[PDB]
Amino acid sequence: GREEAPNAEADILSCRLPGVVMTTSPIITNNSINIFVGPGTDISSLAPEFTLTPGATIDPPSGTARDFHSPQQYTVTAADGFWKKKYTVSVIDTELATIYNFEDTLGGQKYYIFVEREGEKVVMEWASGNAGYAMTGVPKTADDYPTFQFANGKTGKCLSLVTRSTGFFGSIMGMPIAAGNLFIGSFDVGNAMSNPLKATKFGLPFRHIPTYLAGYYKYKAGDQFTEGGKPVSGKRDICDIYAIMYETSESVPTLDGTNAFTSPNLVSIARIDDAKETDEWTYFKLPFHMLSGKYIDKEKLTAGKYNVAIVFTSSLEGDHFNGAIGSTLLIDEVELIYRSE
Ligand SMILES: C[As](C)(=O)[O-]
Ligand SMILES: C[As](C)(=O)[O-]
Ligand SMILES: [Ca+2]
Ligand SMILES: [Ca+2]
Ligand code: NA
Ligand code: NA
């Protein structure tokens, strides 16, 4: 029958590049698309094609050739001619960034999105659950979210991850707390409050053999550990810091919160095993373990058939709502170290 609440604004629902192999699915947010192509692809004249909300139009039209050396804007107008939305569409044609100083974020947003740059060119957007937290109605400003930027880093600014209450609305959804996280991948806001573990899509293509994840942290557990909203006395919160490498396929384009450590597609895992509460910047250097009966194939590697994810969280079991509100993980000067070829 007739739609109950018409969604007003019209969306780009998909993106593809006819005749170019994308290295992973385009990452679509409310007002942005990131398209990934192999290093060496000519990006001076790409012609993205979109699907849209029925009855919408897009300007310039779907299939217009443009120069994506810089991001290009499109406007979608709803059928009614009143509602419009601007999207920024960017093409990433470089290999994954591996040096993270947490200085750079996207301006003009209601919460922080950390990016990696080469000069003025953005080459990666980190993801978090921020889009999901916005849906609880709790945050007022960028600093109220679980994932934000803090001025006092080890050098310059740093990443700050704080486990937050999700308030009344979060509790009625069975989601009473929100861990601060940051990861390589994307956040699918359509699952944020229906299948939250499916919302965190971990990994992007990586064409080297990672050997160590290194960097610095500080950590303070929150005062009162809770399990599904219920206080528990014997427990102190702890952070998690980890990285995974897995082989992609038609059936496994990404891993997520349901299978980050268990998917048979995993080839390698690095993970902190001596995390502690500390107010001093503490070095970690996590070796990647290649898993039993797995191997990194050279030709798959060069073809881009493996993804790597790096994940930080202020509450190790926060993804299952076990954690302490106020748990705070600061991260700075991280490096993904890989073998020289
Ligand atoms: C960061 As947005 C307004 O494209 O979801
Ligand atoms: C109705 As409008 C502000 O999306 O042009
Ligand atoms: Ca608008
Ligand atoms: Ca820094
Ligand atoms: Na919309
Ligand atoms: Na960087």
Author numbering: 0, 21 to 360
Give sentences copied directly from the paper behind this entry.
Genome-context analysis lends support to the involvement of this family in carbohydrate metabolism, which plays a key role in B. thetaiotaomicron as a predominant bacterial symbiont in the human distal gut microbiome. BT2081 consists of an N-terminal domain, which adopts a β-sandwich immunoglobulin-like fold, and a larger C-terminal domain with a β-sandwich jelly-roll fold.
The crystal structure of BT2081 was determined to 2.05 Å resolution using the SAD method. Crystallographic packing, as well as PISA analyses of BT2081, suggest that a monomer is likely to be the biologically relevant form of the protein, which is consistent with results from analytical size-exclusion chromatography (anSEC). Another shared feature is a conserved calcium-binding site on the convex surface of the β-jelly roll. As a consequence of these extended loop regions, a significant distinction between BT2081 and its structural counterparts is the presence of a deep solvent-accessible pocket in BT2081 formed by highly conserved residues from the concave surface of the β-jelly-roll core and five of the loop regions extending from this core. Of these residues, Asp259 and Asp338 at the bend of the pocket are particularly interesting candidates for performing catalytic roles because they are positioned opposite each other in the pocket, with their carboxylate O atoms being sufficiently far apart (∼7.5 Å) to accommodate a carbohydrate substrate.
